Amino acid sequence: DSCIQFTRHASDVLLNLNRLRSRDILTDVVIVVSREQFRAHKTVLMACSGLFYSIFTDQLKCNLSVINLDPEINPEGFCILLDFMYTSRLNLREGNIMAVMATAMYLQMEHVVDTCRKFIKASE
Amino acid sequence: DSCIQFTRHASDVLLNLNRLRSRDILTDVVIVVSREQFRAHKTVLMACSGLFYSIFTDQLKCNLSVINLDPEINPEGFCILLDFMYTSRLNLREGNIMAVMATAMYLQMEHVVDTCRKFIKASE
């Protein structure tokens, strides 16, 4: 086509989606990770995670308002990844890298798994 | 903070949101523009438009599944803008620029109004 493109559009959309999340506006699911709960938008989760894409395209699970993750999943690891989904920013640290990588593998977030593997290989 | 950032993340999220829209997955509103209907996600509309942000933060309107736009709004103009919201790409042409600008003004999409004004000024 002969379209023009607004460079910052995708980033501005994501910034607004994060603002809606912070104010709990039109959030439609709560992700339970052991003792912790995280409110989010199903569409953003599906757009970032192979696991959530699978869950919310399921004819029964698409209607659930609560999703319980595997008890081995670390809440801090999940929190860091949920923040990444809504911001493009990953708070990767020596103290959390193993939990972040294991959570990214479970959530099926290939690019996060890739940078974790690379940061781990550099430290060995 | 000491975060790392994935450059393509925002664009990949938007691409997936558009794929969900095309397959009618978790769309939660229909926008009626005279004889035409457009299914979309409320969060994306709010993230792109001052008008939709106002509508869906309203305590009564947030729960509506159908929103009827002003009868002066052109459906093709709306379609071009809805595509822009989900892709960052604006199909701006001599034959549609007046309708696109009027629709962008109504929807409160400042950056679209700005490029329309500039393209119009160049042709006079």
Partner: peptide, 4 residues
């Protein structure tokens, strides 16, 4: 705005 750019030509993509």
């Amino acid at each position: 705005w750019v030509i993509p």
